[PDB]
Structure formats: structure tokens, C-alpha cells
Scaffold this active site. Structure first.
Site, PDB file in Angstrom:
ATOM      1  N   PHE A  69      -3.567  -6.277  -1.524  1.00 36.96           N
ATOM      2  CA  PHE A  69      -3.032  -4.987  -0.927  1.00 36.96           C
ATOM      3  C   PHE A  69      -1.018  -4.751  -0.781  1.00 36.96           C
ATOM      4  O   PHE A  69      -0.402  -5.535   0.307  1.00 36.96           O
ATOM      5  CB  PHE A  69      -3.470  -4.431   0.609  1.00 36.96           C
ATOM      6  CG  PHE A  69      -3.073  -2.623   0.843  1.00 36.96           C
ATOM      7  CD1 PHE A  69      -3.101  -2.233  -0.500  1.00 36.96           C
ATOM      8  CD2 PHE A  69      -2.894  -2.619   2.114  1.00 36.96           C
ATOM      9  CE1 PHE A  69      -2.524  -0.586  -0.020  1.00 36.96           C
ATOM     10  CE2 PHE A  69      -2.271  -1.381   2.254  1.00 36.96           C
ATOM     11  CZ  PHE A  69      -2.942  -0.115   1.404  1.00 36.96           C
ATOM     12  N   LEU A  70      -0.915  -4.571  -1.219  1.00 42.47           N
ATOM     13  CA  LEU A  70       0.566  -4.363  -1.748  1.00 42.47           C
ATOM     14  C   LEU A  70       1.302  -5.595  -0.577  1.00 42.47           C
ATOM     15  O   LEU A  70       2.029  -5.589   0.017  1.00 42.47           O
ATOM     16  CB  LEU A  70       1.303  -3.279  -0.377  1.00 42.47           C
ATOM     17  CG  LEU A  70       0.666  -1.887  -1.163  1.00 42.47           C
ATOM     18  CD1 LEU A  70       0.784  -0.871   0.504  1.00 42.47           C
ATOM     19  CD2 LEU A  70       1.531  -1.672  -1.111  1.00 42.47           C
TER      20      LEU A  70
END
Ligand code: HEC
Ligand code: HEC
Ligand code: HEC
Ligand code: HEC
Ligand SMILES: [Ca+2]
Ligand SMILES: [Ca+2]
Ligand code: NA
Ligand code: NA
Ligand code: NA
Ligand code: NA
Lengths: 376, 125, 355, 376, 125, 354
Positions: A69-70
Site C-alpha cells: 500500500f503506497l
């Protein structure tokens, strides 16, 4: 003009004709060089993401790294390694969160370190290169934390261990200038110099304020660590430059990327990575187009190139695509990389004539971030 | 449709990126994955943190303050993606900054981004 | 009659003859010059007020009457949240039900009973004239009638503009008459983005017509006992102020330790703060909130004492969902919140703001 | 005419106009009914995937569920729960593999059980609905294993525990018929009946071989547990119907979905879920187009509808889009669901006349599997 | 490019889905993510299991057995996706079945699908 | 010329004069009627052979000579994998270097020296002529030249079309002259999809011209000791057969327990199997690989004994990456593999197959 796939079909056919045997195996990527380029796909906030390792001279994918995630990618300037700070969950996007840093070998792409970050301390935000950063010796990774408050996390890559969180003032981004020092940008319009040991209150010193409360400094400044040059556009194409090379901030004269006529006719910067800086040429590249003042994250179709010293326009390229991010190789006769999020394509340009030379498509879901190593 | 033109709000369709209250949305509209304009989808967790924009309402001529909220704990919905930036300021003005994942406060420490709701919290230009 | 009733209540409000020894009126503890709060010093400073006997102290801080008339009557809403009422524990239904209580409360105005209150009202020819005009002949001869009539008049008086004028800088800024300073504007922006708004705004969403900065709900924010106030009240070192659970009829132990969210209008001028007056400075009341979000050791320390905030009086039913927001207020934001809360000050109290 | 997003802006404007306050909150999905449809996106073998919950009457997404690598969904026929067997890895698509079953409440979408499956025993394959199956009592989940050999895992949803693996012969798929019994389809072209008690080998009995070694049965038979009807198409559109309602396999009259002339003009079934069966109507729907014999997984533009008993054709719909998967709701006046992997859009048709009523787009990356509950 | 048309193999470009050896490929071509026709990209794990197809080579008119092999332990590459099914049989004939994630034998127990290589192992016969 | 040399080796090959007591020739243990293996029953049945003294048994199963001519000379390849040579442990570089060693081996033909070989060679007027025509006058008077010439003759004989005729059904099917049965083709399919092809194919990719179903490499597949063959060999219950490592000049501990991947041609008629003849039946050899993949109790048990296979003679350097394929061979696929392997039998040995 013979393509990759075509040359490859010709060679497999010749091997087959010759009775050439070879062992199917895991390839090594070619040695990191000045024309390798990495493109990170935050994938519009998807819980898992990809990076592509590209040979920009060939226009060819030479490898890929998975992330969660990111994640925040970083690439050692000397080519010895790559790393990222990533976040995963026990059940896709739900359950217990583990934040971690991996280091990878740049030719086998295998993880050589996987360092747990305790208490899920990363800042989850659309990817900003200078929210996770390497020190110039490659020994320490610094990552930003927003909750409960602005802080910077120190990761020892050498000893492969998380060290500590450092408390900072109301400031953002991390520009390392030494093994133990980095700059941030503060709400009050100054930079803060942060000097850190293994323990103690880190020494935090603000510079002079360098811009008014109503000039807006973009989330994607260009920072050349080897030059110590921080190149920081505002919403209007006004360009701040700070020389960090002495290890303190020296404020350089501001230049205007656009003319007064172009400003009156609605020209403004915009996209994601809007600005690039070529160290050896001392040139700045800026993504610009005619746009309403609040469409600052939209793609742009033009790049202005200007001499960082004088502000003189050297060129204005019509990119011919919707470009969100740019960056350049740091070699002689650099490539200008021009990444389209909407197109999921990296277009590769001669940075001198602005001509498109080649392109690499199918780069994930919403590729946004271009990273190069500065190897010379 | 021209990405660079001044944004033009409407008050006739909430699933659309030019719906007036989405003037500073970044992500996805929750209505499109089983939330509503101001409620999260089942199985997600409503953040208590917020971002604000002042959005012009072409129905009544007034500007309202929209305190956006994320619905968290799910992978990104992928439906009705939108990015607007009316009044959006850089990260160091976080109250108006919309690249941040504003999932703070969500039940069960949910922090993945699923979608955003657009409730009004008061008036002001 | 709408005028005349308020006008009667105005007379009663300032009349110390409704107290046992006639030392005390509503206005004594609810002083018009201090936004209807008690400026008087007691054994606990300003935290709790002293009754007519000159010695009894209560156990809660005297709240403003400003904007108290915007509070809905006590009810349980559909989500099972209790809302509205008067008193910090909501035990009165509304202003009328509340108004006779100070009168008979031995720790406040201390009249023995309704009959004795009627007798005082009867002694004044202006009350015989004004009460009989509104309520009819012989009203003051019936202790039940007379006591109800005074409560009604007092309630009508608290519902006048004098009490809720809406002329703060906030209101003037909301009407476009002026603008906030940049610090005030940032403050307002923090208030609405951070968790304050989850409790200190009238509506969950949409726009309030007459905002008073409370949702009128009941929450336990985990405040410790105010030791000096608690000693003054003489309620006992083993006493627990159960907040709403004390309302007769509330039995749910989940309501233990929840108090009504106060309007923040005039907050800058009605210190000390919280239901037991435990915090002296406005900044301190804002900083208490960081005990739930900040990981800095300084966040668990009351700046007024240099000691830990304290164990909550009721260390259960805390509003942790709202309180543990994951984001602490740095100093610049607390500064902005103080500047914004100061805009909530009524025009007539602006001069109080300097000090 | 008024779209959902229009109706909703009007209701929101009216709420604003009236000064109506309402608490932002987590919505509950409407009660499960006959018109609820689930669309599973295996995302072209992505490590994480999504299931969309849709009210097919409104053509509204009412919720979503996340899953790992190639998850198997199941939906209780009585509407009381949903489940899937899923697979995650400790670092996205690398590291320790965890296979598990989740059960979900179907109005809150909250996980009500998470039951780890020992030794990563799931079969990882392009999603086949009957590789994982609920028993009719809903108390037991059975999932297929391929490696080291064919085997079937018994999962207790009530005790919320994995029980044991059963050895089976060289067979595939799981069609449960009773609390302790399921059929599978064997390499030799028989069906095998598997009966397990708590202990010992299962009792395994084979039927007659019911197809020749060179008639190929698709990976996506339609099975109706409540009618005990196993509808099994071959590559040519020939259709096997096996009746399992007695506890035992009676083989029904076989039937042909396309005509002789149609298989001369190259009409063949093709898609993923090529076939659907409506139980109370006793009626079969088949995805078909003109295609080469080895283009058997490509989309089709046409649905033919035939009677399960007589095999007479009742309708042939021009779908109007490239359809990869079909299914129907199990109520009167059924909806016919038509999932295009390529458009990522579920088109929802009147099963009666075939016209498209409404559609639901942006259904992930490569949606492939429609699941509905048979509630009446 | 008509998807239901008979497949037309070519021997001039390995990245395209009409490449002769890809006649039963399911997934992605490893040459597009840093492998090559017969090698895996860095960081992946080569499976020891395979799928076989007999594939027609338009260049010499000869039929070769391609024993496909998966490169495993990475999320699907998303580049040059291809699904061809020449001679591909249902799952109960698994030696010819291509929905199966044929990652068995891969180092480190790698079982996620990244891409597929297309080596020749014999002439059909 | 190349022809006469091979005719010379044809003579020597069936000549018992090259054994000490004249009781045995190469063909005694490499019986032409048994695909050049040993038909004779011994203290350990057919696991190992008896030499010229009538008593001494070897410790390794006598392998076929068919196809041995296709094996490259021993070398270490660029991946550092040893390949080729002769014997189960590759200790001979090639056929020529192998040929003299049975002659001088006391447990085999048992000649005391090259000199005694030469003396026996000179006793036969047909050899004086045959050898002198090829290597010159006096060749047999020089025992080093005589022995080396006999070795060359034998090696040239083994490299004839007779030893490697490529006329098995499988060769016929590859030539498009006939088809496999469904079972055989399934078997071929199972052989190329499953782990067998990883070791038992000449090449990793492309097409082999003269496939012999070995990559010439060295692998320890973790076989147990052949208890009765070991007792018969007299090498002692202490003894460990280190495979490749026993080649002189191999020093690397990683080669211990490794043996040359045998060509599977004629496998069906050359039981018992493995380097030590531990398994009598071909099915048992196939089933043994299931020890590394199946979880079933039955996999842990040798069907010929009913007891566990037993621990590896050498329990390190196992080729696990290859052997632990994740997938087991059900009975059906073992059936097919057997059928396919039987198609590897030369024309002339087809009648043995019954
Ligand atoms: C000795 C001081 C004193 C006097 C005199 C007094 N009050 Fe109060 N007032 C209090 C205190 C203390 C509270 C909070 C009590 C509690 O919550 O239990 C209070 C609360 C109230 C409230 C509830 C406000 C809220 O926000 O919940 C109203 C209404 C009120 N007073 C009106 C009056 C009226 C009318 C009179 C005259 C009849 C009066 N008071 C006399 C001290 C006093
Ligand atoms: C979860 C509910 C909730 C949240 C969040 C909350 N408050 Fe409060 N607030 C209360 C309640 C309840 C009280 C009264 C507590 C007590 O006295 O028992 C209160 C009291 C106050 C007071 C004292 C007012 C008085 O008259 O004594 C101030 C000032 C205040 N809050 C400001 C804030 C600010 C600023 C924030 C955001 C940082 C905030 N609050 C967040 C519920 C909340
Ligand atoms: C007493 C039985 C016996 C006799 C006689 C014998 N051999 Fe052998 N042969 C064997 C055994 C046993 C092995 C395997 C020994 C080992 O691997 O160390 C073998 C191995 C070989 C090999 C290697 C084949 C391979 O695939 O590794 C060749 C070549 C060979 N023999 C040729 C000959 C020739 C030529 C003669 C006559 C000089 C001969 N043999 C006489 C039993 C015998
Ligand atoms: C790791 C490499 C490897 C793999 C995989 C492998 N083999 Fe072997 N095989 C060998 C070696 C090495 C030997 C001789 C081993 C020994 O005797 O020490 C052998 C021996 C055999 C023999 C005995 C041949 C003889 O002449 O004695 C048969 C039959 C056989 N294998 C069949 C198979 C089949 C069928 C498979 C697939 C199910 C298979 N093998 C997989 C390397 C392998
Ligand atoms: Ca107070
Ligand atoms: Ca043998
Ligand atoms: Na005190
Ligand atoms: Na009570
Ligand atoms: Na034995
Ligand atoms: Na050695």
C-alpha cells in the site's frame, strides 16, 4: 526500428535452426547504469502495487518489484541497491498492518533485507519521492510520519534494523544532505535543518522564511542530493531554488518558468512530478500547460527547459502526450522521461531536442513516479 | 472533459466527478461502492479525520464547507474515481490537502483507502 | 404577555428575596457581567459556587445561561443517545423544570419549600401586580401555582435575546460583516477538521441556523475528580459523580460518567472549565484532548499542575472512538483553536477578553 | 430514466433545503434476496481480488468483499451467509502462504469466521465455482486439492474448524448432495460418489463412464444443489444432465444446444461460465458464438435458451456485448446476468425477452464469476 | 485481431499474442517483464511442473512440443497478457490444462503467477 | 578400417581368453541376448554379477552397453555440473578408458596384468593377424600397446550401430512411422510434464537428434543399500558407495552419493534397477520417486518388500529441487510411464518384453 520482440523472434528462430540448447533459468537484470529508470505505480491507492525497472536506452522492462500500500521507492545513486518502505495487512486491506523496509539487489532483484517497522509508523499518502529518502552514504533510510504528528523514522540499512522516530516541528518532506542530517519544509515557510544522533533531542534549526503564506510550494520538488540543489516550483511556475551544498540553506534567485504573457494567457505548471533537474547541465525541466489555477494535478503537454543559473528559457517541448511526471537521466545527452498516468506509459525523449525516441507501455494501473540513479 | 479547464460544478448527479460537493475529492465516490453521498459501504470503517473544501453549490448560489471523510479497511473501490482540487493546498497545509490517506480514527485501525463521502459541515466563502 | 412574562422573570432573576437569608439571586451565581457565570471566589477558587448560607459549596461548576435556551428538552434520540436537558447531568427536562431547583436546594438559594417562596412573592406589591396580570388572581396564595409561575417567568426571561444575542465575531464573520484574522481562520479550520466538531457542533451535517457549538449529547471525556472542589462540596472522598446516570429514571450503567456537551459560546470568558471546573485556562481544556492522541510524555501532564491529568472519575464509558483520533494538536493548532474559540465571545463580553 | 446518482443528488438537495440532519455512518446492505448478484474478479491472476455485491434490480453495487489469490466464493442458498476460501502471502505474492476460509454476514459484510486451512492445501486455478462448495445444510465447506494429489478438504463452518483431507481417485470438482456426500468428476469419465463419516477412508463408488475420452466437459458446469441438477456442457455445446436428487446419479437424456447446421457454420459455446440453469423454470442458458474449435475461452455475443427436459430452444439473444459469463436469478421473471471480462461490466438482462435493462460497470480488472443464491 | 477467429501463428515477434510458441499460453509473456522467451525475469522462481501443447511453427511447417513453465512468486506482471488455448483440454486432463497455476516445484514454494515462458522440448511426432 | 577395428573388438568381446581362468568374456556379463546385461543368478539374484573366479560378486549392477557410445567424455560443464564418462560413477573418461578395467579387476575377469592379457592375445594366430593389420607388426609383443589396442577395438565395437540402433517403438513414433497407444502417449506426456524430463532427456530445450533419455548428469536420488548385494559383494556392512566422488580427482563433497543418470533405453528388459539392482520391477523404480511427493502411507513403503524403502545410503546431496515436484504419480500415471518406458526397448529385445 526492428522492435525488441521482432529481434527476439529472429534470434530464437536462429537457435532453433542451429540446434542451439540453453538452460531455462532466472535472468539477471543488466548492470545498473545511467539509463536505467524505475517507474512506480501507486495504482490509485490499491493495496498492492508494482515498480518497473526499465532500461531507458532500449525502452525495455528488465525487471519488476512488488510492493504493498503506497510504498515509497528509493534508489541508491551509485547503483548498488534499491529499497522501499511498504505496508501490508494480514487480510489484503484489513487486519493487522505490518510496515517494513526491503532492500533489493539491483541485478537479481532479490530482497537482501526485510526490516520490520514497529507500530505501523509510515505516512500513507499519494507517493511523494521526498517522503522517504536515503542518506548520501546509502546507510540510512529516513521515512516521514504524519500521525500522531510530523516525525521522521530512522532505519539502519547496514545493520538492517529500525532505529528511532525523531520528533519534528510542523514540517514536511525529507531532503538528506549528510549521514545524519536532513532538511524539511515547514508550515511557516522556512526550511528546518534536522541533525540526529542515535539518541538525544535532534538539533532542529529553521532557516529564514523564503516564501509568503499565499505562494504554494508543490508536493514534488526536485532534489539533487549530489548537487545539494533543491528545486521547488510554486503553483504559478515560479521556481525556488535552495543550494544545500554547504550543508546550510543558501537561497538562490527565484526564476519564473513561464513568461508574463504566458501567465496572462493561463499557463501554469501541473501534474504530479512536475519538475526535473539535471545536475551536470544545471537545467530545470517543468511540466506546464494552459490551465485554470485549481487544475494543478492534471497532466500537462509541454515541458519548458531553463538554465537554472539565469532562468533563460532553453526550450519548450511539445510532448504530444498527457504527461504527469517527468525526470531525466543524469548522464551526458540525458533522456527526458515523460510518464503518463492516464496512458500507463513511459515516453522516453531526447532531453536536448525534446523528440520522443521510444516508449514503454503497460506500466500498471496509475504509474506516477519516475526514479533514476545519479551515478556519475 | 478538458482536464485543464476550470471545474464546473453541477447539482444533478452525485456519481459524477463534477458533482458540486466533490470539488476537492481524491479517490473514489462512496456512493458507487454501496455507501451513499454521506455514508460508508458495508464492511468498511468510517474515519473521523476530515479534509475541507469550500464548494460552490450551483443550486442555491452559496458556497459550503465540505468536510470529506474516508471509508477505510478495504482495497480501493475502483469505481467512480475522481480527483478535483478546488482550493487544494500542498501537504504542509494538511487541512486542505487531499493526497493524504485520511483514515485516522477509523474503527479497528483501518488505514487502507476505499472511498470518500462528501457531507456538508457549514457555510462560508 | 410574551414581553411581560420575560419582564417578570427579569425581576425574579435579580431578586435575592427568593433565597432563605435573602443574600442570593440567580444573578449572584449567574452574573450578567461574566456571561451569566459566578465570578465569586469559594474554597475551590471559581470551580464551584457558594450558596445562600455563605458556606455550602456545590460539586459542579456554574455554567453560563447564555444560549441555554437553544438546548432541546431532554430526550433519548433514535440512536439511543440521550440529548438535551439542563444541568451538567441532564436531570432537568428543560429551563422551566430547572428554574425552581436552585430555589429549594439547601446548597444554593435554600428556601425550605414552595410555600415559603410564595410568601416572599406575596410580600412584594409588584409581584402581586405582575404575577396576577399574567397568571390570574390569587396565584401567589397557592404555593404550587406561584412556584410554577415563577419558574415559567424565569424560563421566558432566559429565552430572550439578552441571553442569546448571536453578535460574536464568529456571527459577524458568518454574516459577511467582517473576516477572521488568519490565526482565527486556521482555528476554525482545525475545529472543523479535527475531532472537536464530532461533539461541539449542533449537527452531524448540513448547516445550523443558530449554532451553539454543542450537539447536546452526553459524553465521558475521562476527566479526573476536582479534588479541591470535591473537598468543598463535602460529598465525600468515596463519592462518584455519575453524570447522566444520576438523572432519576436513567438506569443504564453505560451512562455513568457522561456529562452534557457544553456550548462553547462565551467559553473564553466563563473559565474554569469542565463540569467540576477542574481546568483554569482555555488552553488547558484544549490540551486535555491530546492525552488521547499524543505519544509525547508532555501530553499526559496537566500544564497547570505539572502532574498527570489523573485517573478519570469514571474510568468506564469513555468516548474513545471520538477521543482517540490518531492526530494530536501541535502547539500552532492549539494557538489557532484558542483564537477561534475567542471569536465565540458575545459582543458585550469582548472587553472581558483582554484579561 | 432518473439515474441512481441523479435521484441521490435530488434527495441530498432536498435534505439540505429542509435542514435535515443525518449521521454519517456504515450502511448495512439491503437484506439478501433473489435479485442480489455477486461478481468475483480474479483480476487476471492478481495476488489480490474483489467480489462486488450487486442489487441486480436496481443495478446497484451494494457492497464489496476483498479476497487474496484466486479465491473461491460460495453463497448460502438460504441467504444467511457468504463465504470464500482465499490465499494470502506474507509479502504480497512472495513469502509464507496462508490459506483460509472466511464466512461473512451478508448485510454487514463483516467476517463472522476466519478458519485457517493447514499446509496451504488450496488448488490455485482460474476460478471454478465448484472447486469449493457448501453442503446443503450450510454447515460444511468442501474445497478441492490438486497437489500432491486430488483430495478434498472438509471444513466445519459451525465448529469453525478445518477437519481433515479426504483421498479421492483421479477426479475433479465437488458437487455436494448431502451433509456427508459429494460427487466429483473423474479422469476415466465416470462420476465418483464420495461419502465420508468422521473416520477412515471415505466410501467411494463410481458410476458408469458417461462420456468418451475425446468429448471434453467444460470447467464450468452449472450445478443446482436444491434441484440436484448437474448441467455439464462439452466443447461442442452437447449437454450432460446428471440427476443427483436420490443420493445417487441418474443420468438424464443428453441434449444439444446448437443445431447440426449451427455446428457446420462453426457455432460453439465459449466463454468462462458458459452455462446457467434456472431451477423452477428448469431451463438452460448457454453462451455461444461462431468461433474456431480452440477459441473456447473467448467471449460470446449470443445466448441460447433451451428446456432442460425437451431440449427445445426457447430463445436466442443477441447480447450486444462481448459476454464471458452468464448466470440467472432464481426467482420468477428471472434476470439474466451477462458479465464481460473485457468491459468489466455486468449487463443485466430480462431473462424472458433478453433485452438489456441496465448494467453495472467498473467491476474490477477481469471479472469472471457470477454467483446467485437460490432462495425460493 | 477478431477474438473468435482461428489463430494465425507468426514467427516474427515474441511479445505479441499471435507468436507461434504461445499457442496455449495462459497469463503473460515473460519477455515483456524482463525474462526472455525461455527465461524467467529476475526475482521470480521457475516452476518444475509444466504444461504441454503441440504448437505449429509457420516458418518450417513443423510441430513442436512446447512445455510451458511458470515464473512464480510475483504478482501477475500485467504486461503482454495473452490467453490462447490451442489443444487446451479441461482440468481433468491437467497435462493439457492451462487455467491451472502450474507453479509446483518452484523454489521457496512460490505459487503466485507472474508470467510464462515458451520453450520447445520436442517435435510433436 | 574403422570397420576392421570394430570387427576386432567383436572378437575380443566374446573371448573368455581375456579372463584369468578363461571362464568369462565381456559378453558373459554384458549378454547380447539381455541388452548387454547379466542374465545370471547370484548370491544376490540379478543385482550384481559374479566374476571369473566363480565367487567374487561386484557391488554394482551391470549396466547395458547399448547407447553407451552416445555418452560424451567426462567433463564439468560451464554450470559446474559433471557430465558423461562411463560406469555408474563416471570414473572412466570414455569407452576406451573403460575397456581395460574389467580385464584387470579381480572381482571380474581377473587378469593379473597387461602383460598376461598380451600373452593371451599372442596365443591366438587370428589376433596376431587382426591386431598387426590395424596397429602394426609387433603390437602384441608390447603389452602396453597390446592392451590399449584391445581397449580401442572394444570401444570401436561398442560405437557401432549394433549397440545403438535407435529402432525402438519410440524412435518409430518420432519418425512418424507409427503411433503410440493412448496409454503410451499419456505416458510420454506424463514423462515430459512431470519431473522425469528434468534428468532423463539429453537437452533442456530444442530437439534432440539421438535422444537417449539421460542428460548425462550425476544425481543422488537417495536410494538405500541393496542389503543382499552388499553382503554378496563382500565390501562390508560398513561400506558406503560414494558414487561420483569415488572418481579420482573428484574432491567436491557435493558429488558424494551421485550416480550417472542412466539412459532409459531398454530399461524394461534390463532389471533389476538402480546402480545396486535394489529393485527387481520397473514399476518399483517409478514408484520410488513418489517417496518425495506423495503423502500417502503407501508411498513410504517399497512394494517388493512391504517395508519402508529404507534410509538413503548417502543421505546428503539429494536432488530435492528436482525430486520434490509437489506432485505425486497416481496408479494411472505409473501405468502410463511403464507403458511409455517399454516403448524404449530396441527392436531385437521386444520379444523379452513378455
Ligand atoms: C449558588 C449558585 C447558584 C444560584 C443562585 C443559581 N444557580 Fe443555576 N447553576 C448552578 C450550578 C452549580 C449549576 C450546575 C448544577 C448541576 O449541573 O448540577 C447551575 C445550572 C443552571 C442551569 C442549567 C444550565 C446548563 O447548561 O445545564 C440553568 C438553566 C440555571 N442554572 C438557572 C438558574 C436560575 C433561573 C436561578 C435562579 C432561580 C439559578 N440558576 C440560581 C449555580 C446556581
Ligand atoms: C467526544 C466528545 C467530545 C470531543 C471530541 C470534544 N469535546 Fe470538548 N467537551 C466535551 C464534553 C462532554 C465536555 C464537558 C466534559 C465535562 O465537563 O464532563 C467538553 C468540554 C469542552 C470545553 C470546556 C467548556 C466548558 O464550558 O467548561 C472546551 C473549551 C472544549 N470542550 C473544547 C473542545 C475542543 C477544542 C475539542 C477538539 C480538540 C473538543 N472539545 C473535543 C465533549 C467533546
Ligand atoms: C563380471 C561381470 C562383467 C564383465 C565380464 C564385464 N563387465 Fe562391464 N560392467 C560390469 C559392472 C558390474 C559395471 C558397472 C561397474 C561400476 O559402475 O563401477 C559395468 C560397466 C561397463 C561400462 C560402462 C557402462 C555405463 O553406462 O556406465 C562399459 C562400457 C563396460 N562395462 C564394458 C565392458 C567391456 C568392454 C568388457 C570386456 C572387457 C566388460 N565390460 C566386462 C560388469 C562386467
Ligand atoms: C534428479 C534427476 C532425476 C529425476 C527427476 C528422475 N530420475 Fe530416474 N534416475 C536418475 C538417476 C541419477 C538414476 C540412477 C540412480 C542410481 O542408480 O543411483 C535414475 C534411474 C531411473 C531408473 C532405473 C534405470 C536403470 O537402468 O537402472 C528408472 C526406470 C528411472 N530412473 C525412471 C524415472 C522416471 C519415470 C522419473 C519421473 C517419474 C524419473 N526417473 C525421475 C535421475 C532422475
Ligand atoms: Ca466554567
Ligand atoms: Ca539393471
Ligand atoms: Na482544584
Ligand atoms: Na439514575
Ligand atoms: Na537384495
Ligand atoms: Na575422488
Amino acid at each position: 526500428q526492428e522492435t525488441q520482440g521482432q529481434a527476439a523472434a529472429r534470434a530464437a528462430a536462429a537457435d532453433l535452426a542451429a540446434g542451439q540448447d540453453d538452460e531455462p533459468r532466472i535472468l539477471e537484470a543488466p548492470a545498473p547504469d545511467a539509463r536505467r529508470v524505475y517507474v512506480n505505480d501507486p495504482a490509485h491507492f490499491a493495496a498492492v502495487t508494482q515498480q518497473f525497472v526499465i532500461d531507458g536506452e532500449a525502452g525495455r522492462v528488465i525487471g519488476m518489484i512488488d510492493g504493498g500500500f503506497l510504498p515509497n521507492p528509493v534508489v541508491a545513486d551509485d547503483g548498488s541497491f534499491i529499497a522501499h518502505a511498504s505496508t501490508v495487512f494480514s487480510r489484503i486491506a484489513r487486519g493487522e498492518r505490518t510496515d517494513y523496509v526491503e532492500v533489493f539487489d539491483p541485478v537479481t532483484l532479490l530482497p537482501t533485507a526485510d526490516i520490520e517497522l514497529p507500530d505501523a509508523p509510515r505516512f500513507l499518502v499519494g507517493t511523494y519521492p521526498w517522503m522517504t529518502s536515503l542518506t548520501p552514504d546509502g546507510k540510512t533510510l529516513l521515512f516521514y510520519q504524519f500521525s500522531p504528528a510530523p516525525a521522521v523514522g530512522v532505519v539502519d540499512l547496514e545493520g538492517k534494523a529500525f532505529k528511532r522516530m525523531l520528533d519534528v516541528p510542523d514540517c514536511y518532506h525529507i531532503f538528506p544532505t549528510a549521514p545524519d542530517t536532513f532538511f524539511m519544509h515547514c508550515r511557516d515557510g522556512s526550511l528546518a535543518k534536522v541533525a540526529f544522533g542515535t539518541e538525544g533531542t535532534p538539533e532542529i534549526t529553521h532557516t529564514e522564511v523564503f516564501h509568503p503564506e499565499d505562494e504554494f510550494l508543490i508536493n514534488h520538488p526536485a532534489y539533487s542530493q549530489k548537487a545539494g540543489r533543491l528545486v521547488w516550483p510554486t503553483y504559478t511556475g515560479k521556481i525556488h531554488q535552495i543550494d544545500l551544498s554547504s550543508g546550510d540553506a543558501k537561497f538562490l534567485p527565484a526564476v519564473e518558468a513561464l513568461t508574463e504573457a504566458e501567465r496572462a494567457d493561463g499557463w501554469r505548471p501541473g501534474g504530479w512530478q512536475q519538475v526535473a533537474y539535471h545536475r551536470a547541465l544545471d537545467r530545470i525541466y517543468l511540466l506546464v500547460d494552459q490551465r485554470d489555477e485549481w487544475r494543478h494535478k492534471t497532466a500537462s503537454r509541454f515541458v519548458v527547459v531553463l538554465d537554472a543559473k539565469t532562468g533563460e528559457r532553453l526550450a519548450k517541448f511539445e510532448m504530444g502526450h498527457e504527461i504527469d511526471s517527468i525526470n531525466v537521466s543524469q548522464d551526458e545527452k540525458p533522456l527526458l522521461y515523460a510518464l503518463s498516468t492516464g496512458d500507463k506509459t513511459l515516453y522516453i525523449h531526447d532531453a536536448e531536442s525534446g523528440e520522443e525516441l521510444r516508449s514503454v507501455n503497460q506500466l500498471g494501473h496509475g504509474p506516477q513516479v519516475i526514479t533514476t540513479a545519479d551515478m556519475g | 472533459t478538458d482536464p485543464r479547464a476550470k471545474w464546473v460544478p453541477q447539482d444533478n448527479d452525485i456519481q459524477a466527478c463534477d458533482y458540486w460537493r466533490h470539488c476537492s475529492i481524491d479517490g473514489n465516490i462512496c456512493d458507487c461502492s454501496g455507501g451513499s453521498l454521506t455514508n460508508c459501504p458495508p464492511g468498511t470503517k468510517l474515519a473521523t479525520a476530515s479534509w475541507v473544501a469550500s464548494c460552490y453549490n450551483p443550486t442555491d448560489g452559496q458556497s459550503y464547507l465540505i468536510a470529506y471523510r474516508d471509508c477505510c479497511g478495504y482495497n480501493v473501490s475502483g469505481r467512480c474515481p475522481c480527483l478535483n482540487t478546488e482550493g487544494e493546498l500542498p501537504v504542509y497545509r494538511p487541512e486542505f490537502a487531499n493526497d493524504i490517506i485520511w483514515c485516522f480514527g477509523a474503527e479497528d485501525d483501518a488505514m487502507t483507502y476505499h472511498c470518500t463521502i462528501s457531507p456538508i459541515v457549514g457555510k462560508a466563502s | 404577555a410574551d414581553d411581560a412574562l420575560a419582564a417578570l422573570g427579569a425581576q425574579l432573576f435579580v431578586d435575592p428575596a427568593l433565597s432563605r437569608n435573602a443574600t442570593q439571586s440567580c444573578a449572584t451565581c449567574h452574573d450578567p457581567a461574566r456571561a451569566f457565570t459566578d465570578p465569586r471566589e469559594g474554597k475551590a477558587g471559581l470551580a464551584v459556587s457558594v450558596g445562600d448560607d455563605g458556606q455550602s459549596h456545590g460539586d459542579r461548576n456554574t455554567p453560563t445561561l447564555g444560549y441555554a435556551a437553544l438546548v432541546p428538552a431532554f430526550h433519548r434520540d433514535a440512536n439511543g443517545k440521550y440529548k438535551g436537558g439542563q444541568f451538567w447531568d441532564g436531570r432537568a427536562d428543560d429551563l422551566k423544570q430547572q428554574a425552581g431547583q436552585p430555589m429549594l436546594n439547601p446548597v444554593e438559594m435554600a428556601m425550605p419549600d414552595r410555600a415559603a417562596v410564595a410568601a416572599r412573592l406575596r410580600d412584594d406589591p409588584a409581584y402581586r401586580t405582575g404575577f396576577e396580570a399574567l397568571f390570574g388572581k390569587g396565584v401567589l396564595d397557592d404555593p404550587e401555582r406561584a412556584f410554577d409561575a415563577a419558574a415559567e417567568a424565569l424560563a421566558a426571561y432566559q429565552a430572550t435575546g439578552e441571553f442569546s444575542p448571536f453578535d460574536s465575531k464568529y456571527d459577524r464573520v458568518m454574516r459577511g460583516e467582517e473576516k477572521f484574522t488568519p490565526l482565527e481562520e486556521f482555528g476554525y479550520t482545525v475545529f472543523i477538521t479535527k475531532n472537536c466538531r464530532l461533539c461541539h457542533m449542533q449537527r452531524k451535517q448540513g448547516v445550523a441556523e443558530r449554532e451553539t457549538f454543542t450537539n447536546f449529547e452526553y459524553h465521558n471525556i475521562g476527566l479526573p475528580v476536582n479534588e479541591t472542589a470535591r473537598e468543598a462540596s463535602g460529598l465525600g472522598a468515596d463519592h462518584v459523580d455519575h453524570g447522566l446516570l444520576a438523572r432519576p429514571g436513567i438506569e443504564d450503567p453505560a451512562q455513568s460518567g457522561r456529562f452534557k456537551v457544553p456550548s462553547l459560546r462565551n467559553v473564553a470568558v466563563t473559565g474554569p472549565y469542565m463540569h467540576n471546573g477542574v481546568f483554569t485556562d482555555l488552553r488547558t481544556a484544549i490540551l486535555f484532548y491530546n492525552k488521547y492522541t499524543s505519544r509525547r510524555p508532555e501530553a499526559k501532564i496537566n500544564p497547570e499542575t505539572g502532574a498527570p491529568w489523573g485517573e478519570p472519575e469514571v474510568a468506564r464509558n469513555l468516548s474513545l472512538a471520538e477521543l482517540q483520533s490518531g492526530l494530536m494538536l501541535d502547539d500552532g493548532r492549539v494557538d489557532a483553536l484558542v483564537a477561534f474559540l475567542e471569536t465565540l465571545t458575545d459582543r458585550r463580553y469582548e472587553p472581558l477578553l483582554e484579561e
